[PDB]
Write a protein that binds this DNA or RNA. Structure first.
Ligand SMILES: Nc1ccn([C@@H]2O[C@H](COP(=O)(O)CP(=O)(O)OP(=O)(O)O)[C@@H](O)[C@H]2O)c(=O)n1
Ligand SMILES: [Mn+2]
Length: 347
DNA sequence: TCTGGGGTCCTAG
DNA sequence: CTAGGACCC
């Protein structure tokens, strides 16, 4: 018996969804962003089709930037209702396969297949591609390995519309020259710190003395990085309801903000908006965090724990309005954010 | 071609 | 008990 982990990632997801209802736009540059107006400032690309990516457009890029880089791209507004519906369909469809299925956000899922040892993980991956293509119209890629992090890395190589197998057999030969941030979990900061320790590749980190890392990163993070560099990872595909820990709404305003009357009303509204949504989900708030960001793009957040789990609107808005009070100035605030942390204990 | 929004987790003081 | 650093989709 061979335990496989398959990572299923829908290609160009938001674009592909748009493509189902604009099938004339296939093989053309399509950019999905804040409101379909590229001229609109303070807005960014949410998803760039593969054709738009050939001109350098990528998620995070301001839409003005991307229209300069790709003037013939069709810009479409974000339509979250249509993406929730596309997502639940394809997943709902992948539950119908009878393997354990772990869903990660919207596009992506992990599938646990224990295969007799007669069978072919490549074989299962194509079916998933064929059924997904045939029933939803969307295209997916599948990375295959024996643990979640390495399967995800395999998806990187499987894209677009493909399948890639990444195991102990080929991990180090495929990945050993890559910089540490190619690993899932590792970003530019860690890379930079590892660079300052003489570790500039996956292969270097894999043979790095445990002590160096556990002194530098903590006795659990240090060993985890070593695990990751050797291609290790989580191996259990948990098929259970994901329970959110928090919900949050931030907003960067069309105009910079200076007078506090606006600032208070925004954090009040964010607080209430957030709280109704979690009241709908049968959740209780534990702590209220407020975020401010200046014209600098400075950015700092503050949290306060409620005296007791609560759902009380007045007590929560006041806490949010009280935490906003601590932030120093009444500058040009670019962005205001409220996150509610939720109880994790019972229902 | 001035910089989005929703998340999780872990470790310092 | 919190600050925020770091990564992720
Ligand atoms: N910064 C980000 C990164 C991602 N997302 C959202 O997450 C989905 C997939 O992430 P993803 O990272 O797998 C990309 P996908 O669009 O499927 O392209 P691919 O086929 O080559 O992977 C996207 O369609 C975005 O709306 C976002 O809002 N902000
Ligand atoms: Mn994805």
């Amino acid at each position: 018996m061979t335990k496989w982990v398959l990572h299923v990632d829908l290609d160009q997801f938001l674009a592909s969804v748009e493509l189902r209802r604009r099938p004339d736009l296939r093989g053309q540059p399509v950019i999905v962003g804040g409101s379909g107006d590229p001229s609109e400032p303070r807005k960014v690309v949410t998803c760039a089709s593969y054709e738009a990516r050939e001109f350098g457009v990528h998620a995070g890029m301001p839409l003005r930037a991307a229209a300069r880089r790709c003037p013939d791209a069709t810009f479409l507004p974000s339509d979250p209702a249509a993406y929730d519906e596309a997502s639940e369909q394809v997943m709902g469809l992948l539950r119908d396969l009878g393997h354990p299925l772990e869903v990660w956000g919207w596009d992506e899922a992990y599938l646990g297949a224990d295969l007799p040892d007669e069978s072919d993980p490549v074989e299962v991956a194509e079916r998933i591609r064929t059924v997904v293509a045939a029933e939803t119209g969307l295209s997916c890629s599948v990375g295959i390995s024996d643990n979640k992090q390495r399967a995800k890395v395999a998806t990187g190589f499987a894209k677009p519309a493909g399948i890639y197998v990444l195991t102990e057999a080929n991990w180090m030969t495929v990945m050993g020259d890559r910089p540490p941030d190619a690993l899932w979990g590792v970003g530019p900061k860690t890379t930079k710190k590892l660079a300052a320790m003489g570790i500039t590749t996956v292969a270097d980190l894999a043979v790095t003395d445990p002590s160096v890392l556990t002194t530098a990163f903590g006795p659990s993070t240090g060993l985890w990085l070593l695990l990751l560099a050797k291609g290790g990872g989580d191996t259990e595909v948990s098929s259970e309801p994901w329970v959110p820990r928090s919900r949050s709404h931030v907003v960067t305003f069309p105009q910079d903000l200076t007078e506090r009357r606006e600032m208070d009303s925004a954090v009040r509204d964010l607080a209430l908006q957030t709280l109704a949504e979690i009241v709908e989900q049968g959740r209780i708030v534990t702590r209220v965090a407020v975020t401010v960001r200046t014209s600098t793009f400075y950015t700092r957040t503050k949290i306060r724990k409620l005296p007791a789990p609560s759902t009380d609107a007045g007590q929560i808005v006041d806490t949010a309005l009280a935490v906003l009070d601590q932030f120093e100035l009444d500058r040009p605030v670019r962005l205001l954010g409220v996150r509610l942390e939720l109880a994790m204990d019972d229902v």
